[PDB]
A paper describes a structure:
Among them, the ubiquitin-like protein Atg8 (called LC3/GABARAP proteins in humans) plays a central role. In this study, we found that in both S. pombe and Saccharomyces cerevisiae, Atg8 physically interacts with Hfl1, a vacuole membrane protein. This interaction promotes the localization of Atg8 at the vacuole membrane in a lipidation-independent manner. hfl1Δ and atg8Δ caused the same vacuole-related phenotypes, which are not shared by other atg mutants.
Because a complex formed by ScAtg8 and ScHfl1(368-389) did not crystallize, we resorted to a fusion between them for crystallization, a strategy widely utilized for crystallization of a complex between an Atg8-family protein and a canonical AIM. The crystal structure of ScHfl1(368-389)-ScAtg8 fusion protein was determined at 2.45 Å resolution. Among the seven copies of ScHfl1(368-389), two have a slightly different conformation from the others due to crystal packing, while the other five copies have almost the same conformation; therefore, we use one representative structure of the ScAtg8-ScHfl1(368-389) complex from the five copies hereafter. ScHfl1(368-389) has an elongated conformation with a short helical conformation at the residues 374–377, and forms extensive interactions with the W-site, the L-site, α3, as well as β3 of ScAtg8, burying ~2400 Å2 of surface area (detailed interactions are summarized in Figure 3—figure supplement 3A). Instead, ScHfl1(368-389) uses Trp371 at the coil and Ile375 at the short helix for binding to the W-site and the L-site, respectively, with three residues between them. Unexpectedly, Tyr387 of ScHfl1 binds to a hydrophobic pocket formed between α3 and β3 of ScAtg8. This pocket, which has never been reported to be a binding site for AIMs, is named ‘Y-site’ because it accommodates a conserved Tyr residue in Hfl1. In addition to the hydrophobic interactions, electrostatic interactions are formed between the side-chains of Asp373, Asp374, and Asp384 of ScHfl1 and Arg28, Arg67, and Arg65 of ScAtg8, respectively, and as many as 12 hydrogen bonds are formed between ScHfl1 and ScAtg8 using both the main-chain and side-chain atoms.
Author numbering:
A (entry chain D), F (entry chain A): -22 to 114
B (entry chain E): -22 to -12, -10 to 114
C (entry chain G), G (entry chain F): -23 to 114
D (entry chain C): -22 to 116
E (entry chain B): -22 to 115
Write the structure that this text describes.
Amino acid sequence: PEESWEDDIAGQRTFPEDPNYPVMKSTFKSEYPFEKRKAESERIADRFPNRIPVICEKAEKSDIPEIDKRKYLVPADLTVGQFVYVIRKRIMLPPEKAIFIFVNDTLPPTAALMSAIYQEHKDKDGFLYVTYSGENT
Amino acid sequence: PEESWEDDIAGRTFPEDPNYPVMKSTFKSEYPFEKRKAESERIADRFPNRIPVICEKAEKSDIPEIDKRKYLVPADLTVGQFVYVIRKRIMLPPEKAIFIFVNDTLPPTAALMSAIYQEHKDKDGFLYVTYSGENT
Amino acid sequence: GPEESWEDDIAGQRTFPEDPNYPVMKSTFKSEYPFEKRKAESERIADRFPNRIPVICEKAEKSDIPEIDKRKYLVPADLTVGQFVYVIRKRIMLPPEKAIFIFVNDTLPPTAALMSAIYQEHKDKDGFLYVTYSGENT
Amino acid sequence: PEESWEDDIAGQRTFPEDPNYPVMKSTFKSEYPFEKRKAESERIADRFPNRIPVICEKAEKSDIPEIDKRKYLVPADLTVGQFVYVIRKRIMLPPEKAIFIFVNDTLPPTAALMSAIYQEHKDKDGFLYVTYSGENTFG
Amino acid sequence: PEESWEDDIAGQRTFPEDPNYPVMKSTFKSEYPFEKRKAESERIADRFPNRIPVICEKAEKSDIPEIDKRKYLVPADLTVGQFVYVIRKRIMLPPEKAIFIFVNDTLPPTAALMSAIYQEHKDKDGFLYVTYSGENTF
Amino acid sequence: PEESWEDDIAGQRTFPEDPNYPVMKSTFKSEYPFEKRKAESERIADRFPNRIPVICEKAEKSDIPEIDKRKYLVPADLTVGQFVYVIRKRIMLPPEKAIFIFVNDTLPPTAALMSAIYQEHKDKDGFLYVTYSGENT
Amino acid sequence: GPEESWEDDIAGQRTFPEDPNYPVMKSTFKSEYPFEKRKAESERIADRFPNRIPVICEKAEKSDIPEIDKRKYLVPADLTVGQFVYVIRKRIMLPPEKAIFIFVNDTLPPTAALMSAIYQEHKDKDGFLYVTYSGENT
């Protein structure tokens, strides 16, 4: 025959997390040496003008959802608030939950342009590093 | 497998996040007078020949923000030059007008920032400047 | 959280361009106010401040000398031209190595002329003494 | 807003002279060749019959106030003293300060008529040159 | 620009005399000691043999105009009247107003020669002192 | 600073008479009544006994110089000629010009004594009136 | 104008020269008047003064005795020569210490002679008696 679809994953209305699923996420900087990161940023900047290459990773201690995407090609004219919404849609965080982002331990203002934040805060490797979190540090 | 760069964000008009909570308060409201006067005193002692400007956006204006509001302006700079410093900091395109206000007046372009400071400095030693995309 | 620190990050700049789109317009004093208002004003101020010459001091249009937002000067009658000139200098923060010139009726008043005497001969029909300053004699 | 009047200069501890306001003082004679000057004095004689045309300039070394007027059309019937008072009014020299005038380096008597002083002391170019000072700069 | 001539003194309400204009000249005899005066007159006689050396000053109480010349080298053949006209022309006294002169408080006749007046009235110091006035006081 | 002597009058092309110098040009007799004149001559007779009191005035039609002295106290022994020289010197008439004197409209001889002239011609008031002139009437 | 004062300023002086140009015609009576006029005059006198001798009395030319302007003398007929001589002496004011002489036709008339008798003998054809006076006897 053929298997039928059944809505049977009711759970005990708390769904426990698997006790032994060992996925070992690392920081972007730790996975790639500096020279590789700089070559990549130069290549992306050349290939995508008017785009800010953002490495966006989750704060270590925050239970805000993760996602497998950390590379964001942000149009230079986007505001901080707009980029934050891009992240929200990507991780599918419901609007009632706050989201915060950090560039070097500071909360960028909503109406600042990503290009300006980049101009001030880009890494020596050419990327803009952004941490996102569900709680203010 | 490494993650690929994708030009997938350019996709209409871009809505603002509904719950991204930054303080967004005025400098004077965040710090008491005595702390502010102490700061301006120290900066005057630390950076001679510099005008310490607290530069903030007018609340009702949709001109971009930036995270810098403390500006150490060389005393010989003109108003117009300082305005350009603000523009480049917030990256306002040149086709868009920018205005600044000291005591609710548009200071002249060719005035020296040192003279504007001498006339308009706050009781706490700072020069408070508001920037805007409009002049209402 | 962390307070913004002061950075001396503007002085090191290679250049300092003037802003290309800061649309402030400086009007002539006479052009902003009708005659009868200005005459009423000069009378009112003269009455309120005896022993004072009320001067409207504005920058010559073609001069790149610094401007300033003060143009109403309540000058002691006993001051000389030179002393008043120094008052203007200090107000606009023009460094002393830079020459400064002023004009009443498009003529350069001599130092040690008294402002009271300059006023006696050159006061406007509206009661103010109009003085133009410039960094380049014209 | 509109700019308000403030009496903010009267309370100054001092009032220095400007260190770089360069006025180029030139004697009237040095500014014009003899031809222009004689032509002018003649024109004035024809146009202003009962008037003595006086070029009145400050003695260089004197601390008396200056003024930008140096051409004085003095009615001929005026005495020296009356003309001197005209100078005082024009430069606003306070009465407690003496003032001196000189024609050909001499102090004319107060009751001489300007017409007579002109008759004897007029320049070859038709003008009467008188220098004023706050002291006797020829004694 | 260039200063223009203005007939701006003639319209004045009044014409007061200056309140602090100094008189550096008293009577000729009192300003110089006798020996200097006699030496001077001798010098003039040597240099000018056909000249009467006159010290001519205004009477004290007279409002007739003054003049700065008090030394007159009068030709000996001049009449009193001719010398009187010389004084009138020097001080610019209009002909409609009378002029009088005095030697030793007396009016010399209009047709006496100045040499004769000198011969009788010369001072001990060699000069002839003449007082002029607009009225007959003595 | 002292006024210098300048020969600035002799140069002149002409020398006009003053148009308004009003000095009385009148005769001694018209200025004083007979009583005052006789009183004066009597006082003089007492005060100067050996002196002849002469009132010497110019003929009015004559252009000869005047002088302010008209009272002459003449030594009794002087001749007419000597007295004439006294008049000439007082008025400074140059010798090349003739001089005449008249007593009662007659030319007295140069060698008569003034005392004799007085004896014959004295006025009723006690004076001797003498007219001098540059012309002979 | 104060009254001229009397001054004894002539007698003082050291010399008293005669005027160098006082030209009075010295002329004898006969030379000035023709015989007809003289005779006519003497006849008029003879009718008008019948008891008077008409004498023309003039000074001798070379004599330094004083002159006088009277030369016509109407002499009382009873006068002696000497009395008439005294009349001459007093008219010319010759002091008595000095001698006086008179001449009729170059001869000295006696003192006690009557003038009428001298006239009878010496009268001119023109009717006058001519007498010359002098300080010497020629």
